[PDB]
Structures are given as C-alpha cells and as structure tokens.
Amino acid sequence: MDPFLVLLHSVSSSLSSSELTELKFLCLGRVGKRKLERVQSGLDLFSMLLEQNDLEPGHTELLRELLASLRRHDLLRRVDDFEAGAA
Amino acid sequence: MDPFLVLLHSVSSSLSSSELTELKFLCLGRVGKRKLERVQSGLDLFSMLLEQNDLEPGHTELLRELLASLRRHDLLRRVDDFEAGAA
Amino acid sequence: MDPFLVLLHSVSSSLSSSELTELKFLCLGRVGKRKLERVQSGLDLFSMLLEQNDLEPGHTELLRELLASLRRHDLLRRVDDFEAGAA
Amino acid sequence: MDPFLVLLHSVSSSLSSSELTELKFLCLGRVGKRKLERVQSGLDLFSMLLEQNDLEPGHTELLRELLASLRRHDLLRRVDDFEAGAA
Amino acid sequence: MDPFLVLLHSVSSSLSSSELTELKFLCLGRVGKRKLERVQSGLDLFSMLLEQNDLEPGHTELLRELLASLRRHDLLRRVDDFEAGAA
Amino acid sequence: MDPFLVLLHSVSSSLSSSELTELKFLCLGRVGKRKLERVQSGLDLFSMLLEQNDLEPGHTELLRELLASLRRHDLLRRVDDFEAGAA
Amino acid sequence: MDPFLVLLHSVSSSLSSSELTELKFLCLGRVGKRKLERVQSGLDLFSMLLEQNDLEPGHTELLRELLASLRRHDLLRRVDDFEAGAA
Amino acid sequence: MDPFLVLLHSVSSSLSSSELTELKFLCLGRVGKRKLERVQSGLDLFSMLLEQNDLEPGHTELLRELLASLRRHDLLRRVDDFEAGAA
Amino acid sequence: MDPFLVLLHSVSSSLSSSELTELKFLCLGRVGKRKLERVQSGLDLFSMLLEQNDLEPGHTELLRELLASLRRHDLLRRVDDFEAGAA
Amino acid sequence: MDPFLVLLHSVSSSLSSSELTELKFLCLGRVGKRKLERVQSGLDLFSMLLEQNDLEPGHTELLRELLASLRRHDLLRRVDDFEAGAA
Amino acid sequence: MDPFLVLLHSVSSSLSSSELTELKFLCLGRVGKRKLERVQSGLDLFSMLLEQNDLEPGHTELLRELLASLRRHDLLRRVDDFEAGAA
Amino acid sequence: MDPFLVLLHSVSSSLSSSELTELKFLCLGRVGKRKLERVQSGLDLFSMLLEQNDLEPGHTELLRELLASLRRHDLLRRVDDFEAGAA
Amino acid sequence: MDPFLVLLHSVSSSLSSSELTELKFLCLGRVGKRKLERVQSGLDLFSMLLEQNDLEPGHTELLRELLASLRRHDLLRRVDDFEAGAA
Amino acid sequence: MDPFLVLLHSVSSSLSSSELTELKFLCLGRVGKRKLERVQSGLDLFSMLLEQNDLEPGHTELLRELLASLRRHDLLRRVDDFEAGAA
Amino acid sequence: MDPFLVLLHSVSSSLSSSELTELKFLCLGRVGKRKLERVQSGLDLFSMLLEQNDLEPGHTELLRELLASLRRHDLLRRVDDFEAGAA
C-alpha cells in the first residue's frame, strides 16, 4: 500500500461537492475542459495531476496551496504528518 | 424479518430533520464528510454504522448514547424492550 | 396473465421513492448490496425475491410483513382479495 | 368525482393553521413524527389516514371525533349530509 | 396547433402550486401514487388524463368539475368559449 | 405492408422506457431471462411473442390485457379500429 | 453556414427547461412519445420537426405559433429579421 | 454595461415588499399567475416584461405608469435623466 | 451511374440505427430471419428487396410506405424528384 | 462519544436565534459570507471553526471569548468542567 | 496557482445569493438564458465571462463595474491590490 | 477577536428600537430601501456600512456623527477608548 | 507533427459534450446522419470535414464561424496565432 | 468449490460502484491503466491480483489493507472466519 | 530482450482507448486510413511507425512529441531513463 495514495484517498473522503467545484475552478489552466468534465471525486482530479507530474510523493506544494484556498488546515496537518514519516 | 432492522426503522420514523442534523454532528469523527453528505434519513446513517461495526444486534451502546443526547427517553424504552426479547 | 404478477405490479404502482428506500433497508440481509444498488422500482426488488423463493404465489408472509412496516393497510387488503380467489 | 374526496377537500378548505396544529397533536399516536412533519394542509393528513384505513367512505368516526374536539359543529353537519346521500 | 392543447396550456399557466396540490388530491383514485409523484405542473397531470381517456376534446366534464372545486369560474369561461367554436 | 405490423409499430412508438420495463415484468413467465435481456423496444418483445404464437393477427387478447395494465385506453382504441377493418 | 440553422440555434440558446417542457406538450400530436422522451434541448425538437417538414426555411408558421404561446415577442422579432433578409 | 439594465437595477433596489405586491397586482392581465408566483424582486418582474416587449429601452410608458401609481416621483426623475442621455 | 442506385445510397446515408431496426421489423414477412440477421445498413436491405422484385426503378410504392412509417417526408421528396426526371 | 463534540452540542442547545446572529457578526473576518449564509445553528458554525483549526479540544480561547461577549457565564462554567476532566 | 483565479475565488466566497441574482440580471445581454440557468455561484459566471474574453487578467473593467453596482467597495480594493502586484 | 467588531457589538447592545429607527433615517441616502428594510439591529446596519467602506477601523467619523445626533455621549466615550489603544 | 493537426487537437480538448451537440446541429447539411451518429469528439467531426475539403490548413472560415456561434473567443485567438506563424 | 474463490465472490457482491472506484485508485501502481480500464466488478480486479501473486489463499494482507481503507469491518470479519477454517 | 521493445510495451500498457484515438488523429498524414483502421493498441501503431523509420532506437522525437500532446510527463520520464542507459 503506497502511503502517498492512502493520503490522497483520505483527503478525497473529507471533501464535499461544493469544495470539489472550487478545486476544479483553481485547476482551469492546468487541466483541459473535456477532462475536467469527467471529474466526480477528488480521486479523479488527483489521478490526472499525478500523470502530469503536478503532484508527486516528494513535491506537494500544489496540494498545500489548494487546501489553503479551501481554508482546510485540518487536512494540511495530515499532509505534514506524511512528510514527517516520508522524510 | 430481522428484529434489529425493524427496531432501527421505527427509531428513524420517529425523528425529525433537526434531530438528524444533531446526530450527524455527533458522528463527525466516525463517518467521513463525503459519506455524511449523502445522509437524508436515520436509515442512511444506521446502514453506514452497521458496516463499520459501530452498531450491532448485541452491542447498542452508541445508539443509547445518541438518543440520550437528543433527550429521547421514549425511544430508549423501545431499545430496552428489544434487548429483553433478544436475551 | 399470471394473477400474482398483476398483483405485484399494482403494489409497485402505489408506492413512492421514500417507501422504496424503506423496503430496501428491511431487505439488507436478504439481498446483496451490488444487486440492491440496481433497484429503482418495487418490480426490480420483487423479481429478485421471486428468484430467491422469498416471495411465491402460495407464500406471501414476507410481503405482508413489509407492507405492515410501511403501515399500508389498503395494499394489504389487495393481497387478501388475491388469496381469496387463489384459494 | 368521488363524493368522499370532495367532502374531505371542503373540510380542509374551512380550517386554519391553528386548527391544523391541534389535529396533528390529536394524531400523535396514529402517525409518525417524520411523516407528520410533512403535513401543511388537512389534505396531507387525510391522505395518510386513508392509506392506514383510519378514514374510509363507510367509517367516519375518527373524523367526527376530531371535528368535535375543534368544536366545529358546522363541518360535522356537512359529514351528516354526505352519509344521508351515501346511504 | 391543436386548439384543445392550447386551451390546456392556458389553464396550466393560470394555476398556482397550492391549486395543483388540490387537483392531485381530487385525482387520488384515477392516477396511481408513483405517477402522481412526477406531477410538477398542470400539463403533467393533463397528459396522463388524456392517455387514460378521462379528458378528450369532446368530453370535458372532469375538467369542469375540478375547476368548480377550485372555485375558478374565470377559467370555466375559457372552456365554454372553446366548445362554442369547437361546435 | 402487413396492417398488423404497422399497428404494432405505432404502439411501440407511443411507449416510454418505464412502460417497457412494466411490460417485461408482466411477461416474466412467457419469455426467458436471457431473451428478455435483449429487449430495448416494444418491437423486440412483440417479435418474440409472434414467434411463440402469443400474439396473432386474429388473436390479440394478450396485447389488450397488457395495455389495460399500463392504463393506456388511447392505444386500446387503435387496436379496436384494426379489428373493425380486419373483420 | 445555413442562416436558418443559425437562427434555430439562437432560439434554442434563449429558452429554459420550463419553456422546453411547454413546447414538448404543444407538440404531443406531431411527435411520438418515445422520440419526445429523447428531447433535452430545442435543437433536438427542431431537428425532428425539420425531418417531418413541419419547419422549413420558407414555412415558419408553426415556430411563430409556439413562440406566441410562450409569450416570447423578443424571439419572434429575430424570426422577422430572418425573413426580411431571406426575402 | 447596458445603461437600461443599470437603471432597472436601481429602481428595484429602491422598492419595498409592499410596493412589489402592488406592482404584481397592476400586472395581473399582462403576466400569468404561475409566473407571477416566482417574482420575489423587481428584477424578476422586469425580466418577464422585457421578454414580452412591454418594457424596451425606447418605450418606457408602462414603467412610468406603474411608478405614478406607487406615487414615486423621485424614481420617475431617474427615468427622465436616462431618456435625456439616451436621446 | 444508375440514378436509382444513387437515390438508394442517399436514403441509406440519411438513416440511423434506430430507423434501420424499425425497417427490419416492417419487412418481417418479406425477408427471412437468417438473411435479416446480416443487415447492418439500408444498402443491405435494399439489395435483397431488388433481387425479390419488391423494389424496382419503375415501382417504388413499398419504399414510399416504409418512409411514411418512419415519418420522413424530407426523404419522400427526394423519391419524387427521381420519378420526375425518370418520367 | 467524543466528549468535546458533546460539549459543543450542549452549548448549541442553550442558545437562541438572537445569540446566533451576534456570534455570526463576531466571526465576520474568520468565516466568509457565502459560508456564514448557511449557518442556522451553533453546530453549523462550530463545524466550520473546527475545520479551520480555530476551535480544538486543547485550544478553547475563541469559544471562551465569544461566550464572554454574549455574557453567558453559565455556559463558560460547562467549558471549565470539560478542561478539568480533559486534563 | 494563477493569481487571477485566486482573486476570482475570493470574490465568489464573499458574495450572497441575493448578490448573485443581481449579477445575473446585469449580464442579461452578455450571457444566454440556457447558460445563465446553470449559474449557482460566482465561479460559474466568471468561467463563462473568461471564455467570452469579457474578463481577462489585464482587462478588469467589467468586474469593477459590477462590484460598483453591488456597492461593494471592500471587494474593489482587493482588485486594486491585484493590479498593483500584477503591474 | 477583532477589537473593532467587539466595539460595534457593545454599541448595538446599548441601543433601543426608537434609536435604531433614527439611525436608519439618517442613512437614507447611503443605504437603499430594500436593504434598510432588512435591518432589525445595529449589527445589520454596521455590516452594510463596513462593506461600503463608510465605517473602517481607522475612519470612525460617520459613527461619531450618528451618536452625536442620538445625543449618546456615553457611547462616544467608548469609541475614544478604542482609538486610544488602537493608536 | 503537422501544426494544423495539433491546433485541431487543442480545440477538441477545450470543448464539452453540450458544445459538441451544438456543432453537430450546425453541420446538419454538410455531414450525413449515419456519419454524424458516430461523432463522439471534435476530432471525429474535424476528420470528416478535412476529407470533404470544408476545413484546410489555408482555409479556416468554417471553423471560425462555428467557434463564433459557441461564443468561444478564447479558442478563436488560438486560430489567429496559427495563421500568424503559418503565414 | 475452492473456498477462497467463494470468499472473493461474496466480498465482490457486497461492494458498490463508488467502493470499486476507490479500490481501483489504491491499485494504481500495481495494475496498469489499460487493464484497470476493463474492471467493472471486484471479480475482475481480484482475478488480475491472483495472477500477479498479490492475493493468495495463504497471503491476504493486501485484501485486509484495502477493506480497512473502505472502513468495511463487516467484510474483514468474513476474511477472519476463512483463515480460521483454512488453518 | 530488445530494451527499446520493452519500453514501447510499457508505454502501450499505460494508455487508454481515448488516448489511443488522439494518437491516431495526430498520425493522420503519416499512416493511411486502411492501416489506421486495424490499430486497436499502441503496439499496432508503434509497429507501423518502426517499419516506416519514424520511430528508431536512436531517434525518439516523434514519440516525445506525441506524449507531450497527451500531456503525459510521467511516460516521458521513462523515455529519458532509456536514453540514459542506451547512451
């Protein structure tokens, strides 16, 4: 079980439909419209960002910036715990 | 007809929308946000708690604690009658 | 025209979406989740129960128990008229 | 046009919101809370009582008892005229 | 443009949500519950009544009886003008 | 152009997906499951019933019984006009 | 770019879901139910009417009659400008 | 920014709920009941009147007549300033 | 280039899979099942009808009857233009 | 049952609508307007503050400051009892 | 993280449903009705305006004009800070 | 806890309904009628004035002028103490 | 890598399913129905238009006209940049 | 009947489409994209994992880890009963 | 085992059917239609490109350009690792 994929699954399980709509707006210039139209969960968006090398196990700035815009400091703490054991 | 499922159906039929909102707040750390967003009746919440082994036919403490917070002692008596025949 | 199938069609036409959700909860231990996810009408559920021998033209106790939980005594009278001519 | 349904519509059109609140209290043990929460007119309550066989074209005692508690003897006379032509 | 369908569209445009609820109660024994649950406008109800032959261009008694219960004598005059040119 | 096949095509063009699902339930004991799984229009079902001699140009009782269960008296009138010229 | 098809696209872009439901009711006797069930935009309905020769670049009476029933005199002006250059 | 739409927004922001009720009564024969039931601001009513060609940037008599009935001569002066620059 | 074969190719290019299924049902008694099972385009069906002398350059009634059942009056106009030059 | 969530539920059950309006004003710079518009109980506001890390089981200063502004010293005593057992 | 998209997200989070209704009225002639019917947040409207080149990172007049009509001078200051760093 | 918001809450708690009516008259040309109709406390009015930049933590002249018209020199002293610590 | 084919791929990746349906309606008289039924992406439609010589690297009017009907001025700018380097 | 294959069939029958999507995300680095695109049931995924030696009758850690992420402790009990008889 | 052929097999196993359709469009002028019609996997397309000398172990520009259009930077990293050991 890849620890990074279990972290991304937990973040996706703690988000609502309104929060997903805000994350799809902040990724307007990174992901195309036809692809963003197939996103119905955080896992869909996270998969596309990993394939484009926007999100990587050792590079998580984009994730931290998106969670700060949603004002979710509880989910930002889970990312910190990951980097502390993945150090 | 499983007696436990008929008990849970009666409790769900005796609750209002305000009471459901209070039960979804008390289960913030047990059930995730994306799942709690799909709860529109006590039956939705009860199904998720049974799958997580929080509620079982022979373990009903969590239910009794939630009904005591709603101050519903009439519904707590129905639980007692169940355990008396399921003894 | 099988009289039993015309009875089950009339009962399905007299039920709402809220009532269907209550019937799918009371059949949690009889039908699996992947199959219950495809139920969008009483006819879907009734078909699965006939194939499992839970509902039969000469055995209707499960149906009578489900209608008593919905508190539908008008639909229970239609079942009685069936058994009186199917006697 | 079913004469019984035209009678029940006239009784519902002659009642106020205070009178509806009194009728929902007198039906506390006959109808569940989640269902009574959706009642915004006499027609809503009458529909539920017909489905439970509490009110029938040939059995109107419960209706006559509820109207006597509201002290509405004018509406009780309309019920009498119905039974005199439905005799 | 079928004159009967333009008449039914005008009647539907002159009714409120309270009036629609009263018309769905008076049609309890003519239309089933699962179908009446999909009615959100007079046009939905009128379509079902035409398919059951309850409403026809040359038979409008049921319509006139429903409008007399809503006490809408202005809309009953529009029906009269129709039969006078459809004579 | 066989008049019977033009009648069956008109009936199939006047039915919805919900109505087709009800007709496939009423034919549970006449047609097998593997075959009923390939039915996506009234024409598919009608073809199978003609090959089994359930529907014939001079025997239309099964059709009239299925349309009476859907409460489609407008489509039952089209069948009557057929038998009046096919007399 | 066929001017008639650009006109029909503009009219479809200026209509709501309530207005589409009213247009599908006024076309009950022109288009069958199975086909009307696939209409999710004015463009779907307009395509079917062109194939049946109900709407043509040189015959627009049916369109003008449907827009007058929706009471859309702004969209009726766009049709006039078309016939003035297509004269 | 269309100057006419900024004028109509200012007039809507200077009206109360009592004034809106008076304007919906004076438009009884111009707008249908089902549509007037969705009006909760002057902007809702103004949008419907523009689509029916009752209000236009170069025809404002109906607006001036409605404001004279509310006895609002301050808002009638704002309309005058508009026509003086839109001359 | 035989003009009749160019007409039949144009009609086949203007039809959908749903329309082809309706044409194969209307030809149930003219073409056998094993042969109708190989039809994947209008050209397949047209070839079989020409070999059976059902369709001929100087006899097009069957074609006109099939297009009238599909309610395709645009394609019926193309047949008329053919007979006007093949006169 | 998380003791912190039972404390927050008791505080929410001891507040009125006027008190909630005062708490939403004191949180103007902490929570956005679109989110504060969905607050209809103390539980709604408390959930948002927990997700932003403003309220935590081991950090309750913001809560104590809000209750001191409402001048509710009875509810401040309940917070003290919590920290005394959660010590 | 595109600074322009973070600005537009903050403006959308500081607006109410009444304010959104006013912005959809002021954009009546810029965006069609069928598209404006899908707008449930400022982000929906902003996305459509960016695709039509009405709003651009280096052209923000339309935004400043809409915020001046809502009389939101606090949100107009946030736009100024953006242009000062995007200079 | 923003000190400015605690000051405005104290001023609102020291005012009566007669005083609020006088403050809504003195703000006739600053706030529109439809918005002033929703003001039921000083906090409602203060929120609107902050969004219009009429009241700011470093600009309090409008507040001091309104309190001098109510002849409330006790509340003007509380404003002075604020500016002395916010210096 | 043909620059024209990379441009057409980018335009197809920036379109939704609703936009594709509008483009298939505007190409009703250019492409046949049986072929338009196989279009599930802009790339499918673009391939057919290139083979018919409707779209060419040195003739892009039809593309510019279709994008102006979708009101996509952002995608029209990408076409301009192409012709500026393909000059 | 291999007991391990009957266990895996029961687990697949107790899962929904949302749960399957979560399991396909957690297996991103174990199974390729072209193969994961053919997974429409738990049985499809389980077959691929058995062929790669990720799941074996005597090694079930990966299964237990995936069920713990779905928070399905009821299905984890069925795995325990298997190892107790397969001991 | 030729290292180049193992690289091309891994890239083909990491692509979906939508991605294959995009790659067949970008190779419209390099491969003929009759041959492109037989492509059902990346391996089919790669074989044809090797035979035409478009792809070679020491020339991989075309591959890198196609993967950049699919925006697959993860698969472009695998190509880099190949050239680093094949140096």
Side-chain angles (χ1 to χ4, degrees), chain G residues 63-81:
Chain G
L63 183 60
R64 292 165 101 65
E65 271 132 39
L66 288 165
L67 291 181
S69 293
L70 291 191
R71 305 258 284 124
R72 291 287 301 254
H73 311 286
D74 58 332
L75 258 41
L76 276 164
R77 221 114 70 126
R78 313 163 129 174
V79 182
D80 296 320
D81 313 327

mmCIF file of all heavy atoms in Angstrom, chain G residues 63-81:
data_model
loop_
_atom_site.group_PDB
_atom_site.id
_atom_site.type_symbol
_atom_site.label_atom_id
_atom_site.label_comp_id
_atom_site.label_asym_id
_atom_site.label_seq_id
_atom_site.Cartn_x
_atom_site.Cartn_y
_atom_site.Cartn_z
ATOM 1 N N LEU G 63 -43.415 27.564 -35.878
ATOM 2 C CA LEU G 63 -42.459 28.208 -34.940
ATOM 3 C C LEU G 63 -43.083 29.475 -34.356
ATOM 4 O O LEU G 63 -43.082 29.621 -33.128
ATOM 5 C CB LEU G 63 -41.176 28.535 -35.703
ATOM 6 C CG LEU G 63 -40.040 29.133 -34.875
ATOM 7 C CD1 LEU G 63 -39.619 28.184 -33.766
ATOM 8 C CD2 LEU G 63 -38.855 29.482 -35.758
ATOM 9 N N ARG G 64 -43.607 30.348 -35.208
ATOM 10 C CA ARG G 64 -44.222 31.618 -34.748
ATOM 11 C C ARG G 64 -45.384 31.340 -33.782
ATOM 12 O O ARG G 64 -45.545 32.116 -32.833
ATOM 13 C CB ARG G 64 -44.614 32.444 -35.974
ATOM 14 C CG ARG G 64 -43.417 32.944 -36.769
ATOM 15 C CD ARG G 64 -43.777 33.442 -38.155
ATOM 16 N NE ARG G 64 -43.848 34.893 -38.220
ATOM 17 C CZ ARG G 64 -42.816 35.711 -38.043
ATOM 18 N NH1 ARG G 64 -41.923 35.869 -39.004
ATOM 19 N NH2 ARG G 64 -42.686 36.378 -36.910
ATOM 20 N N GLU G 65 -46.137 30.258 -33.990
ATOM 21 C CA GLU G 65 -47.296 29.917 -33.124
ATOM 22 C C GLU G 65 -46.818 29.414 -31.762
ATOM 23 O O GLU G 65 -47.480 29.715 -30.760
ATOM 24 C CB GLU G 65 -48.156 28.854 -33.797
ATOM 25 C CG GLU G 65 -49.236 29.437 -34.684
ATOM 26 C CD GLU G 65 -49.325 28.808 -36.063
ATOM 27 O OE1 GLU G 65 -49.165 27.576 -36.159
ATOM 28 O OE2 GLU G 65 -49.551 29.553 -37.034
ATOM 29 N N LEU G 66 -45.712 28.674 -31.737
ATOM 30 C CA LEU G 66 -45.166 28.121 -30.474
ATOM 31 C C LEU G 66 -44.565 29.252 -29.639
ATOM 32 O O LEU G 66 -44.738 29.217 -28.414
ATOM 33 C CB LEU G 66 -44.103 27.084 -30.835
ATOM 34 C CG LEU G 66 -44.618 25.774 -31.426
ATOM 35 C CD1 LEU G 66 -43.481 24.992 -32.065
ATOM 36 C CD2 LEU G 66 -45.306 24.933 -30.364
ATOM 37 N N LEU G 67 -43.906 30.215 -30.283
ATOM 38 C CA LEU G 67 -43.258 31.341 -29.560
ATOM 39 C C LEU G 67 -44.330 32.296 -29.030
ATOM 40 O O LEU G 67 -44.095 32.899 -27.976
ATOM 41 C CB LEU G 67 -42.295 32.055 -30.512
ATOM 42 C CG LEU G 67 -41.051 31.264 -30.909
ATOM 43 C CD1 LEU G 67 -40.159 32.085 -31.824
ATOM 44 C CD2 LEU G 67 -40.283 30.814 -29.679
ATOM 45 N N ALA G 68 -45.468 32.399 -29.718
ATOM 46 C CA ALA G 68 -46.580 33.258 -29.255
ATOM 47 C C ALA G 68 -47.247 32.640 -28.024
ATOM 48 O O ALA G 68 -47.773 33.400 -27.203
ATOM 49 C CB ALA G 68 -47.572 33.454 -30.361
ATOM 50 N N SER G 69 -47.227 31.314 -27.909
ATOM 51 C CA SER G 69 -47.805 30.625 -26.728
ATOM 52 C C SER G 69 -46.876 30.797 -25.526
ATOM 53 O O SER G 69 -47.386 30.908 -24.406
ATOM 54 C CB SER G 69 -48.064 29.181 -27.037
ATOM 55 O OG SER G 69 -49.091 29.048 -28.005
ATOM 56 N N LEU G 70 -45.563 30.831 -25.755
ATOM 57 C CA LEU G 70 -44.591 31.077 -24.660
ATOM 58 C C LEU G 70 -44.594 32.568 -24.339
ATOM 59 O O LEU G 70 -43.944 32.940 -23.356
ATOM 60 C CB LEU G 70 -43.202 30.642 -25.134
ATOM 61 C CG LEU G 70 -42.978 29.145 -25.330
ATOM 62 C CD1 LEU G 70 -41.502 28.857 -25.542
ATOM 63 C CD2 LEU G 70 -43.502 28.351 -24.146
ATOM 64 N N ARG G 71 -45.283 33.378 -25.146
ATOM 65 C CA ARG G 71 -45.321 34.857 -24.970
ATOM 66 C C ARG G 71 -43.900 35.415 -25.089
ATOM 67 O O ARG G 71 -43.540 36.268 -24.272
ATOM 68 C CB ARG G 71 -46.025 35.248 -23.664
ATOM 69 C CG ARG G 71 -47.425 34.673 -23.515
ATOM 70 C CD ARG G 71 -48.480 35.716 -23.810
ATOM 71 N NE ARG G 71 -48.631 36.650 -22.704
ATOM 72 C CZ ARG G 71 -48.518 37.969 -22.810
ATOM 73 N NH1 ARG G 71 -48.052 38.507 -23.924
ATOM 74 N NH2 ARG G 71 -48.872 38.745 -21.802
ATOM 75 N N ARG G 72 -43.139 34.951 -26.083
ATOM 76 C CA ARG G 72 -41.757 35.446 -26.315
ATOM 77 C C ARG G 72 -41.769 36.292 -27.587
ATOM 78 O O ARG G 72 -41.534 35.730 -28.660
ATOM 79 C CB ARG G 72 -40.778 34.276 -26.407
ATOM 80 C CG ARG G 72 -40.561 33.534 -25.098
ATOM 81 C CD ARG G 72 -39.735 34.333 -24.110
ATOM 82 N NE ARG G 72 -38.419 34.683 -24.626
ATOM 83 C CZ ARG G 72 -37.283 34.112 -24.247
ATOM 84 N NH1 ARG G 72 -37.290 32.903 -23.718
ATOM 85 N NH2 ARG G 72 -36.137 34.750 -24.406
ATOM 86 N N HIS G 73 -42.032 37.590 -27.456
ATOM 87 C CA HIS G 73 -42.150 38.501 -28.623
ATOM 88 C C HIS G 73 -40.761 39.001 -29.022
ATOM 89 O O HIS G 73 -40.588 39.502 -30.145
ATOM 90 C CB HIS G 73 -43.150 39.600 -28.265
ATOM 91 C CG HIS G 73 -44.414 39.060 -27.689
ATOM 92 N ND1 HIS G 73 -45.368 38.427 -28.455
ATOM 93 C CD2 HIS G 73 -44.877 39.036 -26.435
ATOM 94 C CE1 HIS G 73 -46.369 38.044 -27.680
ATOM 95 N NE2 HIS G 73 -46.091 38.406 -26.450
ATOM 96 N N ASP G 74 -39.788 38.842 -28.133
ATOM 97 C CA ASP G 74 -38.387 39.218 -28.449
ATOM 98 C C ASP G 74 -37.818 38.210 -29.453
ATOM 99 O O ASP G 74 -37.105 38.637 -30.379
ATOM 100 C CB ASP G 74 -37.567 39.274 -27.162
ATOM 101 C CG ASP G 74 -37.545 37.968 -26.383
ATOM 102 O OD1 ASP G 74 -38.519 37.205 -26.487
ATOM 103 O OD2 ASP G 74 -36.548 37.723 -25.681
ATOM 104 N N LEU G 75 -38.131 36.926 -29.276
ATOM 105 C CA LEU G 75 -37.618 35.856 -30.170
ATOM 106 C C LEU G 75 -38.400 35.880 -31.489
ATOM 107 O O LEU G 75 -37.826 35.498 -32.518
ATOM 108 C CB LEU G 75 -37.764 34.520 -29.437
ATOM 109 C CG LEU G 75 -36.496 33.934 -28.818
ATOM 110 C CD1 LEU G 75 -35.648 35.014 -28.168
ATOM 111 C CD2 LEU G 75 -36.841 32.855 -27.804
ATOM 112 N N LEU G 76 -39.648 36.344 -31.463
ATOM 113 C CA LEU G 76 -40.460 36.455 -32.699
ATOM 114 C C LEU G 76 -39.889 37.560 -33.590
ATOM 115 O O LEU G 76 -40.018 37.443 -34.816
ATOM 116 C CB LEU G 76 -41.913 36.748 -32.314
ATOM 117 C CG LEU G 76 -42.752 35.523 -31.965
ATOM 118 C CD1 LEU G 76 -44.029 35.922 -31.244
ATOM 119 C CD2 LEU G 76 -43.073 34.728 -33.217
ATOM 120 N N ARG G 77 -39.266 38.578 -32.996
ATOM 121 C CA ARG G 77 -38.621 39.658 -33.782
ATOM 122 C C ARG G 77 -37.402 39.110 -34.530
ATOM 123 O O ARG G 77 -37.184 39.535 -35.671
ATOM 124 C CB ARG G 77 -38.220 40.804 -32.853
ATOM 125 C CG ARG G 77 -38.489 42.187 -33.424
ATOM 126 C CD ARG G 77 -39.559 42.900 -32.624
ATOM 127 N NE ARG G 77 -39.080 43.281 -31.304
ATOM 128 C CZ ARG G 77 -39.136 44.514 -30.816
ATOM 129 N NH1 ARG G 77 -40.286 45.165 -30.801
ATOM 130 N NH2 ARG G 77 -38.046 45.090 -30.347
ATOM 131 N N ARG G 78 -36.639 38.200 -33.917
ATOM 132 C CA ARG G 78 -35.472 37.579 -34.599
ATOM 133 C C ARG G 78 -35.938 36.793 -35.832
ATOM 134 O O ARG G 78 -35.253 36.871 -36.863
ATOM 135 C CB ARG G 78 -34.684 36.688 -33.633
ATOM 136 C CG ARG G 78 -34.401 37.314 -32.278
ATOM 137 C CD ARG G 78 -34.001 36.230 -31.294
ATOM 138 N NE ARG G 78 -32.766 36.517 -30.582
ATOM 139 C CZ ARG G 78 -32.283 35.774 -29.592
ATOM 140 N NH1 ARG G 78 -32.068 34.484 -29.779
ATOM 141 N NH2 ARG G 78 -32.027 36.320 -28.418
ATOM 142 N N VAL G 79 -37.071 36.093 -35.739
ATOM 143 C CA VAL G 79 -37.626 35.361 -36.918
ATOM 144 C C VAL G 79 -37.938 36.372 -38.025
ATOM 145 O O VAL G 79 -37.541 36.111 -39.160
ATOM 146 C CB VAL G 79 -38.853 34.510 -36.542
ATOM 147 C CG1 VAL G 79 -39.390 33.727 -37.727
ATOM 148 C CG2 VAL G 79 -38.552 33.580 -35.379
ATOM 149 N N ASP G 80 -38.573 37.499 -37.695
ATOM 150 C CA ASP G 80 -38.921 38.551 -38.693
ATOM 151 C C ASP G 80 -37.674 39.043 -39.430
ATOM 152 O O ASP G 80 -37.717 39.119 -40.663
ATOM 153 C CB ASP G 80 -39.613 39.741 -38.029
ATOM 154 C CG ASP G 80 -40.951 39.399 -37.401
ATOM 155 O OD1 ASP G 80 -41.695 38.614 -38.011
ATOM 156 O OD2 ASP G 80 -41.239 39.929 -36.312
ATOM 157 N N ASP G 81 -36.611 39.364 -38.695
ATOM 158 C CA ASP G 81 -35.342 39.823 -39.320
ATOM 159 C C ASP G 81 -34.825 38.766 -40.300
ATOM 160 O O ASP G 81 -34.330 39.159 -41.368
ATOM 161 C CB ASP G 81 -34.291 40.158 -38.261
ATOM 162 C CG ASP G 81 -34.828 41.012 -37.128
ATOM 163 O OD1 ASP G 81 -35.714 41.843 -37.393
ATOM 164 O OD2 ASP G 81 -34.355 40.838 -35.990
#
